[PDB]
Structure 1
Amino acid sequence: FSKGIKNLLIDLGGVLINLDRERCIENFKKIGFQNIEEKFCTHQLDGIFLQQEKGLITPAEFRDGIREMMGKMVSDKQIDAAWNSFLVDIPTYKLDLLLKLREKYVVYLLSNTNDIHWKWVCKNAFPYRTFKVEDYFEKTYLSYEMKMAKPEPEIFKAVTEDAGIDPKETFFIDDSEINCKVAQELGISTYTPKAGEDWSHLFRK
């Protein structure tokens, strides 16, 4: 599209699901993690946060880590609630779009995420009418299952290799410029949506 595109790799954060850093911060202060900002910066993740993203630690360990940094007992589900408040919604017109794109492309998800967040979006964002997450994607490639994260070159190679697809026939939509620049090196074509951009214009005749 015109470019012999057969496959789409779709990012999750921003591109599909709206995010809210401030709300997450506030909810974390509320439960008594007053210095949440010192320790957390999704723009440049560190420590346990980076670790969970590559699946180097379990959710249980993530929660102890959080408990330890807070110096205070706070229940698993209270921790999960604050962490999950980062995630907002996938607008249903994006789900419609993914469903429509199935007619012409094989569609994959490639996402830096973690087990807590993933379970939340599978439960709360993807279900729609009769559909679930499996309905939208041939496969979902998640950093914490792959033990790698964007923008490592190795992740884009692991995906095209695992999927049996040709990078030059693949189009990647990710709101991170660095992610896209690295994918381009492998010959993947890319588009970098702005925050809140409805990128369905990419598909118009």
Structure 2
Amino acid sequence: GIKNLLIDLGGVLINLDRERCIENFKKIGFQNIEEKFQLDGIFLQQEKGLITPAEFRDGIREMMGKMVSDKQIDAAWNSFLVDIPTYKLDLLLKLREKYVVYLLSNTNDIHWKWVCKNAFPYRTFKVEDYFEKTYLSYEMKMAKPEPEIFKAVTEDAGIDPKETFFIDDSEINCKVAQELGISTYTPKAGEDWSHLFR
């Protein structure tokens, strides 16, 4: 039987808009934003916490070749994120009654702060209300689908992979998780996956 839920953030909870993000970057003068997404790239580095938010911005400034404020950069980068529908927050709260609920996400400090400020706050609830713990690539200095991030998660949480269900819209991420004995489901873009618990 399953005791634990590993929930993905991107797509599974928060709706994403790459086109909007691209458009917002071009409107502040980063014309070729769409050509910039590399393994040594600032996007990959910040995902794994190898650089700081300050370094990321300066990275953007650098390939941008222009004066642009921190808030402007953050606003455009954050525009990639849209919303977490509130029925998914209800679902998470509802689920805590029967499972231990965790988050595992490839994300970055800038996005995470925006998410904790703007998507999770709901009624009286904040991010802490939804999860036993949040596992974030840039804090763990690793990234899905590295086999080690899954091991690192179950060991740090003290949970058995075989009693854990993983929900993530990346197939590759699910397929590696499966190797470790974790059960998985791969929701489609914008899918309401509450059907899993009926």
| Counterparts of 1:68 and 1:196, CA distance in 2 | 34
| Counterparts of 2:58 and 2:115, CA distance in 1 | 23
> Residue deviations 1:75-122, cap 9 Å, x none?
000000000000000000000000000000000000000000000000
Query: What's the offset of the Cα at 1:154?
Result: 0.3
Distance 1:50 1:181, change over 3 A: same
Query: What's the offset of the Cα at 1:191?
Result: 0.2
Unaligned runs of 5+ in 2: none
Distance 1:123 1:45, change over 3 A: farther
| Counterparts of 1:107 and 1:177, CA distance in 2 | 21
Q: Does 1:143 align with 2:140?
A: no
SS of residue matched to 1:88: strand
| Counterparts of 2:179 and 2:78, CA distance in 1 | 33
Query: What's the offset of the Cα at 1:163?
Result: 0.2
| Counterparts of 1:77 and 1:185, CA distance in 2 | 42
SS of residue matched to 2:15: coil
Query: What's the offset of the Cα at 1:52?
Result: 0.2
SS of residue matched to 2:172: helix
Query: What's the offset of the Cα at 1:73?
Result: 1.2
- Between stretches 44-53 and 117-126, larger displacement belongs to 44-53
Count of aligned pairs between the two proteins? 198
Query: What's the offset of the Cα at 1:46?
Result: 5.6
TM-score, structure 1 as length reference: 0.95
2:20 is aligned to 23
- Between stretches 46-55 and 181-190, larger displacement belongs to 46-55
> Residue deviations 1:165-191, cap 9 Å, x none?
000000000000000000000000000
Query: What's the offset of the Cα at 1:147?
Result: 0.2
Unaligned runs of 5+ in 1: none
| Counterparts of 1:46 and 1:133, CA distance in 2 | 31
2:72 is aligned, of 78, 82, 101, to: 78
| Counterparts of 1:54 and 1:110, CA distance in 2 | 13
RMSD: 0.9
TM-score, structure 2 as length reference: 0.99
| Counterparts of 2:115 and 2:40, CA distance in 1 | 23
Distance 1:193 1:45, change over 3 A: farther
1:154 is aligned to 148
| Counterparts of 1:176 and 1:102, CA distance in 2 | 24
Distance 1:148 1:187, change over 3 A: same
Query: What's the offset of the Cα at 1:45?
Result: 6.6
| Counterparts of 2:25 and 2:60, CA distance in 1 | 10
| Counterparts of 2:114 and 2:34, CA distance in 1 | 23
Distance 1:25 1:46, change over 3 A: farther
| Counterparts of 2:111 and 2:120, CA distance in 1 | 12
| Counterparts of 2:184 and 2:84, CA distance in 1 | 21
